[PDB]
Structure formats: structure tokens, C-alpha cells
Amino acid sequence: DPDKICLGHHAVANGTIVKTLTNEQEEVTNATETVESTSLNRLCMKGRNHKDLGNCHPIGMLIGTPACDLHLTGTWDTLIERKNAIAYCYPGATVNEEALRQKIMESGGISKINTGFTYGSSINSAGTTKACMRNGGNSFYAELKWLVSKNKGQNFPQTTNTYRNADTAEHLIMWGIHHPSSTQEKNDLYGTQSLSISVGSSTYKNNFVPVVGARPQVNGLSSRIDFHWTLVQPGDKITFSHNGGLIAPSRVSKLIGRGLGIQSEAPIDNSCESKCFWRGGSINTRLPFQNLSPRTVGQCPKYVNKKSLMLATGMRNVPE
Amino acid sequence: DPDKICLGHHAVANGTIVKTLTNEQEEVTNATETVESTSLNRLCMKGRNHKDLGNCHPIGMLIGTPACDLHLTGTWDTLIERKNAIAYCYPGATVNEEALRQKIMESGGISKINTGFTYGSSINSAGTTKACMRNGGNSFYAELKWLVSKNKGQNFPQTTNTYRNADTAEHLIMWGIHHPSSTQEKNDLYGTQSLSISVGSSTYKNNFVPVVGARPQVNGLSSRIDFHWTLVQPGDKITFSHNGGLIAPSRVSKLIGRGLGIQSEAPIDNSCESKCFWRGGSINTRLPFQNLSPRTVGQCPKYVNKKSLMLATGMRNVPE
Amino acid sequence: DPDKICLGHHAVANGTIVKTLTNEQEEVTNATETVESTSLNRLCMKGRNHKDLGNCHPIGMLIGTPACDLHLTGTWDTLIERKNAIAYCYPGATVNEEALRQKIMESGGISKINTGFTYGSSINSAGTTKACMRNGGNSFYAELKWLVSKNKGQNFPQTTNTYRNADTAEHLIMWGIHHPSSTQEKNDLYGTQSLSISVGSSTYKNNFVPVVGARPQVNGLSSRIDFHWTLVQPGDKITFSHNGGLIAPSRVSKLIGRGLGIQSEAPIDNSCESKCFWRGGSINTRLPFQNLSPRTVGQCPKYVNKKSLMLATGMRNVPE
Amino acid sequence: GLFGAIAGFIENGWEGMVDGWYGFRHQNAQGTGQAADYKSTQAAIDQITGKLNRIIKKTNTEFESIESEFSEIDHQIGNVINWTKDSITDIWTYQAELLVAMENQHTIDMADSEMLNLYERVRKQLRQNAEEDGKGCFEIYHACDDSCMESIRNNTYDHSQYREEALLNRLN
Amino acid sequence: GLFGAIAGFIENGWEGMVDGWYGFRHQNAQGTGQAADYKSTQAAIDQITGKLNRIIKKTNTEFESIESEFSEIDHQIGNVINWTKDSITDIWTYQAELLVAMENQHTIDMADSEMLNLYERVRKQLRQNAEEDGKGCFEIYHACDDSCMESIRNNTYDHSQYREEALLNRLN
Amino acid sequence: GLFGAIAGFIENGWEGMVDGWYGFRHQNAQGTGQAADYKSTQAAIDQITGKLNRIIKKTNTEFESIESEFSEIDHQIGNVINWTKDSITDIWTYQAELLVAMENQHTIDMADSEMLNLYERVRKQLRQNAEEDGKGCFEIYHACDDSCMESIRNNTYDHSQYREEALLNRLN
Numbered sequence A, B, C: 001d002p003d004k005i006c007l008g009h010h011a012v013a014n015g016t017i018v019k020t021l022t023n024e025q026e027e028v029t030n031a032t033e034t035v036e037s038t039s040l041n042r043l044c045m046k047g048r049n050h051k052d053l054g055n056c057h058p059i060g061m062l063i064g065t066p067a068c069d070l071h072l073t074g075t076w077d078t079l080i081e082r083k084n085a086i087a088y089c090y091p092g093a094t095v096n097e098e099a100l101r102q103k104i105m106e107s108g109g110i111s112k113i114n115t116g117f118t119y120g121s122s123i124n125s126a127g128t129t130k131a132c133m134r135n136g137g138n139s140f141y142a143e144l145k146w147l148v149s150k151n152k153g154q155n156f157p158q159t160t161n162t163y164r165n166a167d168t169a170e171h172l173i174m175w176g177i178h179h180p181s182s183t184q185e186k187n188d189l190y191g192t193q194s195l196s197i198s199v200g201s202s203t204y205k206n207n208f209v210p211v212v213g214a215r216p217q218v219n220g221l222s223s224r225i226d227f228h229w230t231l232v233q234p235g236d237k238i239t240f241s242h243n244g245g246l247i248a249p250s251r252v253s254k255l256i257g258r259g260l261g262i263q264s265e266a267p268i269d270n271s272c273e274s275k276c277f278w279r280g281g282s283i284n285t286r287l288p289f290q291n292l293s294p295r296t297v298g299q300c301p302k303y304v305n306k307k308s309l310m311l312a313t314g315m316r317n318v319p320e
Numbered sequence D, E, F: 001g002l003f004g005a006i007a008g009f010i011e012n013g014w015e016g017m018v019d020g021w022y023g024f025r026h027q028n029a030q031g032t033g034q035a036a037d038y039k040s041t042q043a044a045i046d047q048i049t050g051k052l053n054r055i056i057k058k059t060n061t062e063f064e065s066i067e068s069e070f071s072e073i074d075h076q077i078g079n080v081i082n083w084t085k086d087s088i089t090d091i092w093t094y095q096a097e098l099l100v101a102m103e104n105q106h107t108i109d110m111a112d113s114e115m116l117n118l119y120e121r122v123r124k125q126l127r128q129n130a131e132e133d134g135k136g137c138f139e140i141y142h143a144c145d146d147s148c149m150e151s152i153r154n155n156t157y158d159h160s161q162y163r164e165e166a167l168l169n170r171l172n
């Protein structure tokens, strides 16, 4: 009877199912996942000079809503925006709002520069409201001035103010137009005269008229302050000509360098690091694909419409 | 003892390293590059009826800046725009500037058609400036007219100018609004009256008010002329209603067919042909990929984030 | 001398040519097409609550052009727009036209809500024209009343009309502005007075002035009625303050849910079912690729720049 | 080819074999015959069916219009859309060409491998009773009648029975 | 499969072989034994490790937001972004599916090739001293003790040493 | 490798074979021989030429500018273009890396298969007249002069002419 040598390969009791070019259900000895299905329910901020805005809306940083008092200036490589964050203590909206939010959330910081705007003796330039509370007292947007007639009912004097950008980088300037709730309010604040607000630079020209109208009650007020913005190029002069209704800037903004804007509901964790963020937190997987969200920022696995894609790490399993 | 026949394969002294599915460092007898890393610092213009604008900005062609005097009209399949090209001799800007630039750089030529606009005896239509010099003399945009009061300080008369498109193809009409440096300048040119410019066609309605304001001195002027443009459809009429501040067109433009717009710093070479261009010149490679720039025009290899990708053209190299 | 058993494979007289990694002309026993070249010249609408607008342009549904009288309201999962479809019976266009058309063709229906606008004795709210006809007589856009002053030359009075959005969803409001052909026509219809139309909500503030200028005869008319549109937020109100020239809305629109918008020349077929549509009709292929058009809507094969791409379904064909 | 059988040491295919992809032709004292092999044929067909199942499909992603058939869209966004759609077309055209080229290479080589695996199974079965002629045939060095030829096709041929006869004839 | 060994002429795998992927079982007068083959095992593992190094990776491209989580973007640009992102997802989903399907086919066939390469190496070593049983075993026609069996596994078996004994036993 | 020949049972390549990719070295009484094999060489070169024809090309798709080299485009559409272009670049970089890795694996394995197919063709030609040494050589058990060696290379070698001599030397 001849002696015998037999050649063979290993097998495992329970193999794993993978797909091939030719077979939907190929059993192999081992396989590993290529699509990440799990996220950390935190924003991993280790190694990042990050700013969590909390209830401060990015636009609130430029106009100086009380909620944004800790976020008026600074530097960051990562800026985190939260749901239902406050921009407007006084009711109103910004024209081209989303464009402005995007620019702030792309920034690596904000510097503030004084406009140097002054007002004659017949102007009260410290108009305040119960809608914008600061230090347990009636206040206003930190970076703007509510200009009204010092004497109730008196015509607001014709005023011209100019901001010159003395810097080598562009500045962002914002202003408001007050839309009174009634003719009685308009007359008391600015007088009976017809109101006209002109804004002019090299790169921007526009004209505004306070529209009197009783709007729905928001923060106890039927009036509105609506905001406008433009960029002031290096060396340029922007001129405000007004006789009532202008909410004038006391400072302009400079957006410094670049940063990663994140919109998320996930709490900060300074103990973990990450390069990939979404609404629900951080993705620290080494895998090439993820099925968490098509909406991610940073350096991320690619989104795929797949629960699982198993990569074989062994031969066909042929058990005994 | 026994005669012997041996089967074998070739090897080379100097193999080439390639990457496989399984091996990062596989030595083969030969390989060829798939990623182009080199370019010609030249615009290969053989077989092209090309226009090199040199110091002339595309928009300067339509309004007739002195730099563009030899590029007011023409035909081409390729239009070459250079860095720091001049559009504006009189300091200012065009509203929707990029859209206009791209539309010119998509064209296969420009034709000019007279507006036939005339003006009352109290209008000086030959306004000139030292900012727009020709042959050591004060001049203006060739395709427009600076309308001012003939008598300094007198109210500019209420004027109406209508252009009818008599062609079967759309015409591109441009006009300027003069924004004086001071009230004195405005009064001297147009008088003390309230200035208003209306422009109306079938496809375009707008109103303009000259904005008085000093801007930084550019080409010796703190005043500005800002440009607006629209397309006049075949058979349509466009009407200008103005009482001072309108810079009125002498001619409208017609963009002829289509052509390839190139923005490049590389000099023309009539000896070589190319279908692929970027800022730095021409890509004549037969290779499928390039890592020169993600910004190319024409028929191009695809940009990849790789220095080199070697395709094996031989078996494993197994030297003795 | 010795017995023999021979192993072999089949062949066919007429093999098919496919491409491999290594061979452009590889003959195999059988292959199958992967690129669809053929379409049904019909819109397969089985299992879809569809609306065929025919001669009615989507925008005509909101303003209520005679051609659209059967499509002023309704619900659908699929909306079909045809070539040369009519929006404007009176010559003119909508500002931001394509955006409105896309919103309508994205929708799953239109609801209509009364503005409740009622006008003084000084106003006739039944102005009609030869350009817009139904029931063999001069008429107007169904969803807007043309407001005319009773006496030729007599000033149209200063009128105020407010629409309140009492709903929990945003409403789409449209209005027209008249642009007279002659200075006489302007004074004839709305009086010698300087006409002004203001539209004001919490989120929208705009001002319109009829530009007097002769446009080319379209539908026998030299003047133009241009349309404007905005969204009214839940709980907000939009106010029209006007003294002639306003074409005021009789109803506002609410777009209901979502549907698939199709632009096609192909006739309707309710007998057959499809998930993929283009200009030329329906694509019901099971193949992964198509070369009919890069413009498709629905669940579609991917467009490729290929006539044919044959997938081998057999071995090499080696005939006798 | 990769496995050297089809368009290789097998000179050509059999147009006459209509009942299978692979099979056998024999010559013995009783005459000649042809039969298809079911298992190898079905293994090749099953693998090709697997490819068609994976490849002959579209995504269920619902795409909506971003281009008007019958009207003008904004020129600048239209340029972006044109750049993007032409970029996507170049990717899908390339992916399609590579998929079918790669699959076609693999289909042809897989079919080759199934022919060789049948050839190899028969070689090991016949053991020391037959010799390869290099043409895809085995010269059998014993009397192998219709029932014997059937045992080879059926994978039940017992070399041990014929060994003494075969070795005598092989060595003379 | 492609190389006809794993799920081919090798009936099934050995669950008992826990120290390697490929190996030997022998039978002689002294008894039976099992031993893993290090070189074939390491060749398969190293190639799969290479695939994992290439595949288990993301790009270092820093993407920024073009969609707001908490507010409305322009509807028209939103429609273009939606079309583009869904087109990119369809591409990556397709590419992911093709990558893993192709790699899995190759991984299985590569493991098959390494099994066949070890088998072929032993066949050529044994030369005229052994015969194939068609099940992945060699019947050795001489006394092959534990040292002899180890010499086959170690690739140091000298056929000439046992050739005379082997040919006599084979031919008889 | 997949076919076990190149960087396998063949220890190394021949730098001295400059007229072919594959071939023969021989030794007999008459002298030392070397000759390239034309058919196997041209099969490998033609398959690699096929790949170069497929891969070394660009699309004829005409792309125009959507980014200004020398001026500012709209910031919001600029962000969309940046996202889209970077997404397209990640796809082409990935497709380029996968294409070359897959093609390189196949090129190497294809070249291996052409070596093995030449070796297998020779094994079958020589039949019972030669034995494999396991290093890619055949020890021929009869006088095989330059005409005999040429007949092996040229696929005209008749095993029956030398069989009696060969079996005598092999068995005794």
C-alpha cells in the first residue's frame, strides 16, 4: 500500500457571505466592512482652535446681538453653528442673508474696526429697546447705533458719514433701515419730513426709504429693523447720506483667513480628534465609504446608497 | 547525462517599480507614465484664427477703452485674455461684470452698429477726460458719449433716445452712469435739478440716480462711471429717458458665432497646434491624466491629485 | 492503435465582436447590448395622476391665461409642459421667469386663495383687451383684475390693498405692472399724476414705476404688462399701495407637495408604465446605459457617448 | 488565453455540439460518439448569469430637471450645469467602457478555465492508463468500449481495473 | 473556480488546520500528521494585506459646506447641488460595488492559485516516485517516514534517492 | 504569481535573451543553444499594445471656462464649482489609481500565463521521453541533437521516433 501526502487548505465552521462579479452569495473564511454605518455623537475638537457659537447666529457676530457678546471678535480654525441660534434681538431680517452666513462660516476669525461716525446735537445716537437686553438693561446691537431725533417730533437733520478702508484687505460693513409700525412712531422718531437713505461706494450703490407698516408682533414689536451688507475694498470710501431711519454702523468687520464651518447638533468633545463632521457628529472611520449622510464637511469617506459592502479577506470557505 | 531543454523569460538590468492591486513596489521590465507633469510655456495657435487681446480687457472691446482701439471689431475661433488687461480708463466697474466677460470670451467675433442717437443744442456730447488719453489728447470711450450741459451750471434738458434692433440677431447694448465726486461737480455738469435715468425695452426695465460721493483717486479721478448692459432682441426698441448722468452708447455690439476663450500668461506660438489650454500654456500630451492644473479649457486629459502613475508594459523583472 | 477520448467546446458559424482589455476585435459565441439606442415616442403615464398642460404654459396657470382656464387648480404626481405653450396673452414677461416655472413643475398641485381685494367707486376692476379673449369677447388674465379709473384723464385714486396669509404654509402672490407705449397713453389711463406702485411685506419691499416707451407690435399691442412674484410667509401680510398701473391679484397660489415635471413633445399613453422620460418620450429599457439624450428626468439609465457596448455572454468563438 | 485551452491547445470548437458548451468526442473499436458535459456547461452559464444580474440594471435615484427643454435658463448657471453634466458623461462613458472591457476579458478567461478544469479532472481520472496528445485528447492504452467511455464522461472511471493492461501497452 | 483546486479537486477545507491557510496531511507506517505551509500561507495573507492598504483609505480633499443644515439656500442653486450630489453618490455607490465585487473575485481566485502552486511544487518534487489520486493527494510508491515527509514539506526531497524502489513498486 | 512560472518555479529571467520575451536554452553533445519563442513573445506584446491603445487617450469632450483666472466670480456659485471640481478630481484620481493597479496586476499575470502555456505545450510534445526538473527544464532521456531541439521549439517534434530509446533510459 503506497504512503500518502495530501495537500489542503483551512476552513471555518461559520464563513461570511460576500458578493463577487459572478456570485451574489459567495461564502469566504473572513471579510471586512468597507461602508461605515456608525458615527460618534460628538464634535471631536482636539487639536482645533474651535469656537462653539451656541445660541449666537453667525450674522449676530457682525451686528452684535447680545447672544453674540462673547463672539464679536477672535480667531478660530473651526466655527460651529447651532440650530435656532439668534441673529436679531429686534425683529427683522438681512437681505442676501445666506450669502453673509456662508462668508462668516468660511472665516478663520473676525476683527472689528471703528467707523468713526458722529452725529449732531439734535440726534440721539443711543436708541435702545427692551427687545435687546444687555447687563439687565435696555440696549441695542453692539456694532450699530439707532439714530433718532433728540426732541420728539422734530425733523432728523440731513447727515453724511463716510467710512474709508485704511487696510490692505477688504472689510464687511452692515447697516439697518428702521421700518416704523405707524405714522405716529415715524413722526416722533424722525419728524414729518420725507425720509431718504443713500449708500454709495466704488463697488456698491443703493437707495432706501423707511416703509411705515404694522408687522406681526415678534419680541413684542410691530416695527422692523432690516439689515444690508457690502464689502469695502482696500482704500475705498463708502458714504451714508440720511435724514432718519438709518441704523448706522459704529464698527465694520474684517474676516481673517479661512476656517471649517460646521452646522451640528452634537456636543463638543475636546478629548477626541476628527477631520470629518456632519449634523449628527464626527466620522473617525478608516473605511473608504459611509452611509450616515450625503451632507459632510472636512476630509471624509464618500457617501454611498449601501447598508454594507463586505470585502473578502480569505479564500472560499468549504467546510467539512 | 540527459540532454536538457530549459524554458525561460527575459529580464533587464534596470527594472521599473509599479503598483498593483496587491503590491505597492512591484518591479517590472518596463512601464509608461499615464500622468502628464510637463507643459509647453506657450499658447499653441497653429490652425486657429486667434486674437491676442494683450493689454485690452474683453469688456474694453465693447465700450472702446484706448487700450482696445485695435480690438473694437473682428472674427476669431480663439480669444486670449491676459493678466492686468485694461477695461476702464475712467475709474469704475460694470454691474454683472463676470457674465459680460464670459459672454465675449465665448464669442467668435464682434460687429458694431451705430445707435444714431442725437442730442439737443443745450447738450455737449463730446465730454472728454485726461483719464482716457489718445495721442496726448483728452478723449473718451470710443463706443459711448459723455453728455453734459453746454452751459456750465445749467440744468441738463429732459432727453429721450431710442435704439431699434433692425437685425435678425440680438444686439448687446451698454451704457454708463456718471457718479460725480462732489455736489459742485454734479451742479456744473448737469445743474441743481434731481437727476433720473430710466432704461426700458421689452426684456429690460431699470432706473438709475447719480450718487454724489468722493472715491479714492484712480487715474487722477475721485468720480466714477459705472456700466450696465442688456441684450436687445431682434425688432425690439430700448429707450433712454435722462436729465443728466447718462453715458449714452454711440454703437451697440453683436457677438458673432462661438469661440474658445483662454485666460493665459504664455506667449503665442504659431508653429505648434493644441486642443487643451491652461494659465501656464498648452497641454499636447497623449496621456489620459495631467497634474498641471484643475483649470483647463478645450479637449484635455483629466486632472488627478498624483505626481506619477506608471502602467506596466512588461512582465515581473526577476534578475539573476 | 490506442482508443481516444477528446475534450472540446462549442462554436457558432456567426460569432459576435466584443472589446476586451487587450483586444478591440474579439470574436465570442454570443454578446448582449448594454447601451439603449431606442425610445418609445410616447409618455407612459400608467399608475401616475398626471396633468397634460397642452397649449397652457405653467406660469399661465398662476396668472390664469385663457389657454390655461382648465389648469388654474388641481393635484398631480406628474406635470407635462409642451413646446410653444402660452403664458402671456398680453405682450410682456415675468421677472425671474425660469425660477417660477421650475417651482410649478416641481409641485404636486396648485390651490387658489382669494386676496379679497375690493376697490372704490372711482375704480372699474374689469379692464379688458383684444390680446386676451374668451367666449368671443375681450377679456383678461383670470387671477388678476385690471384696475382702470372711470374718466379718461381723471387721476386713479391712491388705493391700499393688503393680503393676509392666514394659512400655516407660504403663499405665492403675483402682480403685473403696465408700461405705456406713449406719454399720452400714460396720461390717458392713469392721469397726468406721477404714478408709483409700492409692494411691502415683512420679507419683501419693492417699488415700480411704469416706464413710458414704444415697444414693437405683439398681438396688435405696442405697450407691455410685465409680471412680478414673491412668497408670503404664514401670518405675514403683503400691502399694495398704488395710484394706477398695478395689475392686482384676485387670488394667490399655494403649491401642494411634490411631483415630477416633464418637458416633452411625445403624446400621452395611459396603457404603459415608465420611471424615465426625455423630450422624445419614455425609456423603459432594463439596460444600465442610454445614448438617447443627456437630458432625462426620473429613474434612468446613465447617458454615455457610445453607439454600442457589447457584453460577452459566451466563450471565444473558434469556428471550424 | 490565460488557461491555454480555448483558442489554445484545443485547435477549434465543435459547431456540431448544440446540447452543451463543453463535452467529449471518443474513438474505440465500436466507433465514434459525441456528448455534452452538463456540470462544466452550467458552471460557465451560471457565472455569466451572475454578471448579467449585477450589470443589467439602473439606480433608483429620482433625478429632476435642472435644464429647460423649451426656454432659456440663466447663462452663468447654464455654463456650470454644462461643465458638470459633460464631466459626469465622461465618467459614465469611461466607467461603461472599462466595465464591459474588464468583464469581457474575465468571461473569456473564466470559460477557458472551465474547459481546463474538465480536461484536468479527466487527466487525473485516467491516471497511468492514458497519455495526452497535446490536442485536448487522451490516448487510452486499453480497450475502452462505449460503457468505459461513459464511465470517463460520468466521472466514475476506475483506473485500477485497466492499469496492468495499460502499462503493458504503454511500455510494450 | 479559476484554478480548479479550492472548491474544485480539493473536496473541502480542514477546520482543524488553525496555524496556516494551506498545508499537508500525510500517512505512513508510523501514523498520520498535519503541518501548515508557511510560504503559501504568507503569499496569500501578504496579497490581501496589500489590497486592504490600498482600499481602507479616504481622500485628504477638504470639502466645505454648500448646503445649510438649519436654513434655506436659493432654490435654483439647490436644484443644481441636489442633481450634482445625487450624480456623485450614484458614481461612488457604483464604484464601491464594482471595486468590492472585482477584488472579491480576484481574492478568491488568488487563494485558489496559491493552493495549486503548492500542489504543482510537490508534484514536480516527487517526480516519478508518486502518482496523483485526483483529490489533492500523492500516493508515494516507497517507504516515506516522518523525516522523508518533512523533506517533501521543506522542499528538500531528493527523488533520485527513492527512484529505483518507486519505479519497481509503480510498474511491478 | 497566479500561474506559478514567472517569479515562481522559473528561478529568474535571462538578461542575455534580447530577441524575445520567452524562449528556450538547451544543452546536447553538439553545443549550447538559446532561441526566443516568437508566438508567445508576440501574444504578450500584442495584449499590452491593446491596453496602451485603450488607456493612452483623452475624451473629445470640449470644456469651456467656469472659473476666471484674473478676476473674481460670484462667491456662492464659486463654492459650488469648488465642491463639484474637487468631487470630480477625487473620482478621476481614484479611477486612475484603480485602472493602473488592476491593469498592472493583469499584465503581470497574463505574462505569467504565456510562460506557463509555452512550458505546458513543451511538456505535452515530449510526452514520456522527458521528465520535469521543477525549475522549468525538461531532462530528455534520448540523444536530442540541434534538429531534435529545433523540432521541440518549432512544434514538429514526434515523440514516437525517440520513445523506445527514452523509456529504456528512464526505466533502466
Ligand SMILES: *[C@@H]1O[C@H](CO)[C@@H](O[C@@H]2O[C@H](CO)[C@@H](O)[C@H](O)[C@H]2NC(C)=O)[C@H](O)[C@H]1NC(C)=O
Pocket: B258, D074, D075, D076, D078, D079, D082
Ligand atoms: C449648454 O449646452 C447646450 C447643448 O450643448 C447648449 O445648447 C445649444 O446651443 C447652441 C448655440 O450655440 C444651439 O445651436 C443648439 O441648438 C443648442 N442645443 C440644445 C440641445 O439646446 C447651450 O448653449 C449651453 N448653455 C450655455 C449657457 O452656453
Ligand SMILES: *[C@@H]1O[C@H](CO)[C@@H](O[C@@H]2O[C@H](CO)[C@@H](O)[C@H](O)[C@H]2NC(C)=O)[C@H](O)[C@H]1NC(C)=O
Pocket: C258, E074, E075, E076, E078, E079, E082
Ligand atoms: C434638495 O434635496 C433635499 C433632500 O431631498 C430637499 O430637502 C427635503 O425637502 C423635503 C420637501 O419635499 C422635506 O420634507 C425634507 O425634510 C427635506 N430634507 C432635508 C434633509 O432637508 C430639498 O428640498 C431639495 N432642494 C430643492 C431646492 O428642492
Ligand SMILES: *[C@@H]1O[C@H](CO)[C@@H](O[C@@H]2O[C@H](CO)[C@@H](O)[C@H](O)[C@H]2NC(C)=O)[C@H](O)[C@H]1NC(C)=O
Pocket: A258, F074, F075, F076, F078, F079, F082
Ligand atoms: C475655490 O478654491 C480656490 C482654490 O483653493 C480658492 O482660491 C484660493 O484662495 C486662497 C485663499 O486662502 C488663496 O490664498 C489662493 O491663492 C487661491 N488660489 C487660487 C488658485 O485661486 C477660492 O477662494 C475658492 N473659491 C471660493 C469662492 O471660496
Ligand SMILES: *[C@@H]1O[C@H](CO)[C@@H](O)[C@H](O)[C@H]1NC(C)=O
Pocket: A030, A031, A032, A313, A314
Ligand atoms: C478575520 O477578520 C479580520 C480580517 O478580515 C482580522 O481582524 C482577523 O485577524 C481575521 N482572522 C482570521 C483570518 O483568522
Ligand SMILES: *[C@@H]1O[C@H](CO)[C@@H](O)[C@H](O)[C@H]1NC(C)=O
Pocket: F038, F150, F154
Ligand atoms: C523553425 O522556426 C524558426 C523560427 O520561426 C524558423 O525561422 C525556421 O525556419 C524553422 N526551422 C525549420 C527547419 O523549419
